Design a protein around this ligand. Sequence first.
Ligand SMILES: Cc1nc(N)ncc1-c1nc(N2CCOCC2)c2sc(CN3CCN(S(C)(=O)=O)CC3)cc2n1
Length: 841
Amino acid sequence: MSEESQAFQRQLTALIGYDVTDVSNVHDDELEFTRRGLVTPRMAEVASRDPKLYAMHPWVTSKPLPEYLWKKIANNCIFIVIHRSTTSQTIKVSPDDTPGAILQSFFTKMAEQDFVLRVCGRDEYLVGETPIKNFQWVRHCLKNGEEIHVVLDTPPDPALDEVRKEECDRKFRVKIRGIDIPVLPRNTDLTVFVEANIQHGQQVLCQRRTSPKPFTEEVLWNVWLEFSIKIKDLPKGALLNLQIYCLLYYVNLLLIDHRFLLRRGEYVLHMWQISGFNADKLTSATNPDKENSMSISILLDNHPIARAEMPNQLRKQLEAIIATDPLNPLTAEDKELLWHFRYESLKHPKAYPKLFSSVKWGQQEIVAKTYQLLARREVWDQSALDVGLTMQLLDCNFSDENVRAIAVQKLESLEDDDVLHYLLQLVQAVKFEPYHDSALARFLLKRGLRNKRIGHFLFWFLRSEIAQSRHYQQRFAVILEAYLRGCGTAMLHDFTQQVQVIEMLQKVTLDIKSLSAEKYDVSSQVISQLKQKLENLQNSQLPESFRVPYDPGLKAGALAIEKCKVMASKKKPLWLEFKCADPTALSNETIGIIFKHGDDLRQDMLILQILRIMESIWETESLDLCLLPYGCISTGDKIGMIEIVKDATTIAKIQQSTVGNTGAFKDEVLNHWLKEKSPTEEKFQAAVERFVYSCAGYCVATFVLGIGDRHNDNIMITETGNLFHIDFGHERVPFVLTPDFLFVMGTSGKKTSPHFQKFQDICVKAYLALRHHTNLLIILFSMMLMTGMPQLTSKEDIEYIRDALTVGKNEEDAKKYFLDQIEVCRDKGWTVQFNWFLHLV
Ligand SMILES: Cc1nc(N)ncc1-c1nc(N2CCOCC2)c2sc(CN3CCN(S(C)(=O)=O)CC3)cc2n1
């Protein structure tokens, strides 16, 4: 390597948080093979992308402009203000106008083709052949009733984006020699055995055990486990799962490797423990900690890898099967039915998941017929993209390259707008890939290199996992390094600044938790310290500026120390606020961010993101439920940052405001509070207006996910009437619709107001509109559970959501069912709200 070539990797490693060159936690070369694998897709994409558009990353959408935003223009005319030094002219514009089309208009109307229309305050540009109606920023503006302010400045230089110059029939069998652990201790000497399983996509193909022996730090068997599957019947991506019961430890090994070579020889694998089903169990990675872990020792010794129409009534039997949720499990009679009629099943795209689950992948001949089936793909290829189907075929139930590859094929037609919607879940879905290199891994790579916004979020999502997942940090690290090597020095520089900032801040956050009561209230001595230490960074540490990781358009400047604090929580998160480093920004409002250690924010991200998906699903049907999914990025182990929504108050505090007698609750306060924060009667009804939708919004969403049973503290509202929930870190009620809410709406205990009619009316559309994507939500959710929560019941836990969405019912029985939830609120008022801790001591 070149000397300076090695100062780079060094750079890359500290941007990643893992050393992708290290080879001390491998027993083969699949990861290095995969660094090399991706060089071609990396370069292929770097080469093909437009320098000048990649530079500006215009945020754009082909979707139609929703009905609700259409009424927001009663004139087929849009007002775009333009700024240059002092003065600023305003220009009438048409929804269909174009950036070029108005730079030209601007010059004409003025008593040249080498500038650009940027936004004030942001690195967000209005550039390229898009209708102005189709720029995200513009659609966001019309929503909130804000003028569209744009500065005329010169395009950024593609030079800065430059990328550094790239330089038998034998039954299979396995010999278990022994296990070994440095220190077992627990209590009683329960016997112990191994469980050797041959798995494909969680499907078990075969199973064997060893004579149970009482637990001792060393245990030797020398035993050959004689499997039933034939060496030649082994399918690609087939794991030898090895397990230790007394379930204490597990480890995996791909039996067929990354060059289609059957595995062979001695292996000494270091096993993972079990914390007092989920995707960590599937990992091909071994435990880096070779000092404390249990160890299994094994030996392989065993290469290649080369008409008629249905009756009228089975057809119906089949169509029934195909017409059922992603969970409703298949019986052998189902499975044999889908298979005998592979070809009729193939004419229906929605059958595909179920159909490829009906494959016996422990048989060369039947896998072989499957690929023939995949060959003749005319009908799948033609179909519209169902992100649901696509995702179901990427989950843990499929471990065949070819199945998975045809799903990723289907993603290719997603525009960035949508890639951003599903990016997080796709990145988590990489966990279910048998092999480090993969269609999906290469697709995520392509799309981040093609679009700086996707590149940005892709970086954090990957860095988030590497940082806190030993099971997958290796595989993800290889993919990030892949990314980082083609994003350009422009971006590499932003990531370096961002990584600096957050690391300094995370120092400050933990040092503050250590110095404070186990929970009780911030001392004055903390307020001193916190402000003191921030100033101690504000000088010659904190970089000048940095992109806000949850909003990469926004560049934070210097801290506003006066406005910083430690939050009186229980953990001690930081309430930090920054000046905006952009002078062009037509405001003085700071950029608030919270920094928390002690909550696993990955759950929060996952939830915030589903929330976004919901908001776009209602977009498809012309509905706007005014959610407020604030930004929240996970950065490390139980540690990350959070956006501060401006001018929002907890509902707890608006109640607790008036005495706040631990729980004496009054129905009047909210509506009063709104008028206080509303100077004119005008802006008030607009607040009541929003509340209705915002409230309606969260009632539906919150219920569906089964996180609707929450305390006051964790629900906030803006001075401007937007209600929202927070803190989605992990008798009853369906959701929170307290009498104080209903008061704003007009009701007061088993009555009906004009606005409450409205409320119900909204909720029902919203509930119905979501059921139009039942499949989508069931798959997103269940994937959430496997890759995001603790170890879950791969039946019991997920089952809730099916019920919530009232699967297998008509719209009436379902609308009814929801209205009944509305009622269980009006029957319990404050009771569990009041019950929300009456427990304290
Ligand atoms: C902590 C946390 N963890 C997780 N995972 N998720 C969310 C939150 C979270 N986020 C908040 N945001 C501020 C508004 O924008 C959105 C975020 C707030 S405000 C609050 C009310 N408070 C403001 C006043 N103070 S104080 C005196 O500490 O400043 C009490 C807390 C508690 C709270 N908790």
